[PDB]
Amino acid sequence: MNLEDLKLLKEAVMFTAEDEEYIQKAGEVLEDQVEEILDTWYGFVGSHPHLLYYFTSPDGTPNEKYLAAVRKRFSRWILDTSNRSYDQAWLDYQYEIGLRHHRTKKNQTDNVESVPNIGYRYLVAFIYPITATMKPFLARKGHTPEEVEKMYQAWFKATTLQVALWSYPYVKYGDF
């Protein structure tokens, strides 16, 4: 996609200049608390065997080196999402994040042997737990509940926007 297509997708998730201010604020509050955000996030993935599965070795046990490498890139993604203006380099990388969940690129970044593809049903599903994970963190620090709501809404839009972008390599050609 280019920036014209992005503008149309942003309109569909109701993402505006107001959300670019509040996603920067969310980022500020989240970057503060990244270590326990990560513990929360991997604790949810880790508590369901059918989810933890996508990180496992052939023998069905978690590949700890894979989990470690991914945790680092997840923590970087929290900051990337929080910036003032999504540009073409950002868009190009969103494609890359989707290719990495999909069989096209999964397991190549870390050079691991793991399951070949993340079922698309779960990438969509994960919009919810991603927003649910951040919510209590956004509510910490020192902000009003009205500011907290706008940060949370901003976060929800950005996550939805991104997953829709990540879905490209999964979708039958011409149906995206």
- Write phi, then psi, for 62 (nearest 5 degrees): -65, 135
> Which residues lie near ligand HEM (CB under 6 A)?
45, 51, 54-55, 70, 73-74, 77, 97, 100-101, 106-107, 109-110, 118, 122-123, 126-127, 130, 159, 163
**CB within 8 A of 47, min separation 6: which ones?**
none
CB of 51 to ligand HEM, least distance (A): 5
Distance CA 166, CA 169 (A): 7
Alpha carbon 163 to its chain's center: 7
Report residue 34 as tokens.
């990244």
Q: Say which entry of ligand HEM, a second copy, none residue 156 contacts (CB below 5 to 8 A, set by partner kind).
A: a second copy
- Is 143 annotated to bind a ligand? Reply is no
CB of 175 to a second copy, least distance (A): 5
- Is 140 annotated to bind a ligand? Reply is no
Q: Say which entry of a second copy, ligand HEM, none residue 97 contacts (CB below 5 to 8 A, set by partner kind).
A: ligand HEM
| Residue given tokens 């949810």 in the structure block | 44
Radius of gyration in angstroms for the set of CA atoms belonging to the chain, rounded to a whole number: 16
Binding-site residues for heme b, in ranges, read 66, 73-74, 93, 100-101, 107
